[PDB]
Nucleic acid binder design. Structure first.
Length: 196
DNA sequence: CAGCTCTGTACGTGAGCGATGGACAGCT
DNA sequence: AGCTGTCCATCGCTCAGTACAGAGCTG
């Protein structure tokens, strides 16, 4: 990566972009190599996140990884990952890393209390639900989940990973439905708050 | 048996690598 | 014309979680 070795990137971490009063917190798995390289969320060609954010209308213009720090103030969106350690792919992380991550994540969500905790990847919500709700399904679906983050009003919403690794949603177009339904959920929650 | 957990297998796009060679212009 | 090197179009190729079957486990 411009003369930077994989070994160097594996030591890097990606900072959280979290504030209070957010509508949405996008929760990824862990930083991939390009995210570690750039120091920004979801850069590069192997990820559909920024394209889906625009295609769904969650952003009115096409944004990129460099705009990520403007998302709390301008768009009401923040970022974190379940696991801090950078790896090329999510299958390089251990179960203990995921469960340590899950514990750290629930504390962050209980502190920041966004309207919606968005699990950018079904695999991480599978782990999270088992750890936090003590619930294992048989058969986990995408979209809105039936449990709130403990001691909060924060909802859980799951989308297929924005990574272009999965073949079941091969294009950014195949994932936009979930971003549109996330936008609708946010608007419904804002609509309820106005009506008390 | 019947639900489970765990493990290994199989799967589509499209952006952008290095490699290759065609178009083309400078020079003689 | 003959030669050459650069530019850049284009190539083939790689690769950035999910679903599910079946083995193993347990009530």
């Amino acid at each position: 990566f411009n003369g930077v070795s994989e070994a160097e990137l594996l030591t890097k971490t990606l900072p959280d972009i979290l504030t209070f009063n957010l509508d949405i917190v996008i929760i990824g798995i862990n930083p991939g190599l390009m995210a570690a390289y750039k120091g920004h969320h979801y850069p590069g060609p192997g990820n559909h996140f920024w394209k889906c954010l625009f295609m769904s209308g969650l952003s009115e213009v096409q944004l990129n990884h460099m705009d990520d720090h403007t998302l709390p103030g301008k768009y009401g969106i923040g970022f974190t990952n379940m696991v801090e350690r950078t790896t090329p792919g999510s299958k390089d992380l251990s179960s203990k890393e995921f469960r340590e991550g899950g514990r750290i994540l629930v504390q962050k969500l209980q502190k920041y209390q966004p309207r919606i905790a968005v699990f950018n990847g079904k695999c991480i919500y599978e782990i999270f639900s088992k750890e936090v709700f003590g619930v294992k399904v048989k058969n986990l679906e995408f979209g809105l989940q039936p449990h709130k983050i403990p001691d909060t009003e924060t909802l859980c919403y799951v989308m297929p990973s924005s990574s272009a690794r999965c073949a079941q949603f091969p294009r950014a177009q195949d994932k936009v439905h979930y971003y549109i339904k996330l936008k609708d959920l946010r608007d419904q929650l804002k609509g309820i708050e106005r009506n008390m």
